[PDB]
Amino acid sequence: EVQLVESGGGVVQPGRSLRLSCSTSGFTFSDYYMYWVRQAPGKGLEWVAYMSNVGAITDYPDTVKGRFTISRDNSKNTLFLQMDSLRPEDTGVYFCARGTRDGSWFAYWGQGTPVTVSSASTKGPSVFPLAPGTAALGCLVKDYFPQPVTVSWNSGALTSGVHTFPAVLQSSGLYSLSSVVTVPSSSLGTQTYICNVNHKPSNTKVDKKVEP
Amino acid sequence: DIQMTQSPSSLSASVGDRVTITCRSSQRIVHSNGNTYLEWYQQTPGKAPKLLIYKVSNRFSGVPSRFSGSGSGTDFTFTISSLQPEDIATYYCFQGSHVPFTFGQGTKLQITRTVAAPSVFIFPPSDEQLKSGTASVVCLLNNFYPREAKVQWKVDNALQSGNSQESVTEQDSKDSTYSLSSTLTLSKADYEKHKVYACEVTHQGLSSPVTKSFNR
Ligand SMILES: CC(=O)N[C@@H]1[C@@H](O[C@@H]2O[C@@H](C)[C@@H](O)[C@@H](O)[C@@H]2O)[C@H](O[C@@H]2O[C@H](CO)[C@H](O)[C@H](O)[C@H]2O[C@@H]2O[C@@H](C)[C@@H](O)[C@@H](O)[C@@H]2O)[C@@H](CO)O[C@@H]1O
Secondary structure (H helix, E strand, C coil): CCCCECCCEEEEEECCEEEEEEEEECCCCCHEEEEEEECCCCCEEEEEEEEEECCCCECCCCECCCCEEEEEEEEHEEEEEEEEEHHHHHEEEEEEEEECCCEEEEEEEEECCEEECCCCEEEEEEEEEEEEEEEEEEEEEEEECCCCCCEEEEEHHHCCCCEEEECCEECEEEEEEEEEEEEEHHCCCCECCEEEEEEEHHHHEEEECCCE | CCCCCECCCCCEEEEEEEEEEEECCCCCCCCCCCCCCCEEEEECCCCCCCEEECCCCCEEECCCEEEEEEECEEEEEEEEEECHHHCEEEEEEEEEECCCCCCEEEEEEEEEECCCCCCEEEEEEHHHHCCEEEEEEEEEEEEEECCEEEEEEEEEEEEECCCCCCCCCCCCCCCCEEEEEEEEEHHHHHHCCCEEEEEEEEECCCCEEEEEECCC
8 A cells, every 4th residue: 555654853943954754655656746745733734845756846835945845766765855944834744745647636645744943942741640330531741842742542452432632732831631531430450551642752752550 | 826715614514414615716727738636635633634536526546425526617616415423624625737736724524413411520630740749630521512611610619710721622533522621730739728629510411510529
């Protein structure tokens, strides 16, 4: 199957540079024009660039023309996006996409890589347990910057009944959120519950066991 | 550039309803090669968009038959014949006929379902957070509808205000409900000066307010 995986996203100071990569597999990379599309937090989609499969034919919207440069290494089936003189407005998730022979633009998308242009330093979250018919338990993920943070339960084995709330900004300028799950009260004491928190920007990985 | 304007900006419909979204370009969008590269995308929270329709009316591989597109010139329409719970998302039109390629602003589609009262849970601060000098008390409102809800905190029967924040999940893809979290933040000192903590919930589905609490 077609796979697109972006990487390189991070927290960068205004004016600095960042280089994004998109590794592909499952199709003949050298036969397709490739694209980059981005999405600012809470905003819509915006086409960022395109590049021919060969011949290096490119184009960008005026918002990034002169600052962003798309490139590719057909021998490695990888697409790149060099972003220079980054601005706060460039903040968002950057997607790599491929169209189809017959006329579509973004038929296949990668998962996206987050880019945050900020003057502030990255900060990892603190994680606390939310101690528990059916019972509710969870984890409080507090004081981190920037988004995103991912929370799984029992390493992905527990998904039903899980609710990870959208992060909310606190007065400190830092995000906080809670992730909860409802399970049978009869399971309390027989099954272990662990929330796996991953904050990629700060490479913070926390595993918190939640007990009654 | 070519402005793509979608109508409406958002809407709600019941499962089984026929939904129609429109997109109008500020200029004609017929590519020099004669094709009209108008596409519709679907995006659910946290995930990459998914192509549904391209070249105005062609359904992408794997896309359910309930989705379709049409139009010409500067007016196009996207239609879901029979809405299903999993269709909750933001839909976008896109034009690739003239550079710069542009997207519509997006149309948020929610599902209208029967009222459902929330299940309420309250969580006291963890022992490890307390030794940090702060206490977070959490109140969870699980699986309710509509989105509107009222949460009020009470410490030793005293009404709290200004020391809480709330968050609401995206509408569930299976049961079309919402969940809400309210977090009361106090200092270790304050928290340890009181015994009874409780959150009072008011909602359309509840005949009377529900209160959950605990004794420190
Ligand atoms: C598989 C592939 O990459 N084929 C390209 C083709 O791109 C494909 O078709 C276009 C219309 C678009 O849907 C792509 O996503 C899809 O991969 C190239 O077409 C050009 O693509 C660029 C970038 O999107 C512009 O859209 C450009 O106008 C396209 O050329 C026009 O459409 C072509 C089908 C021809 O009619 C051409 O004369 C038009 O100007 C072509 C470019 O030669 O190269 C591969 O075939």
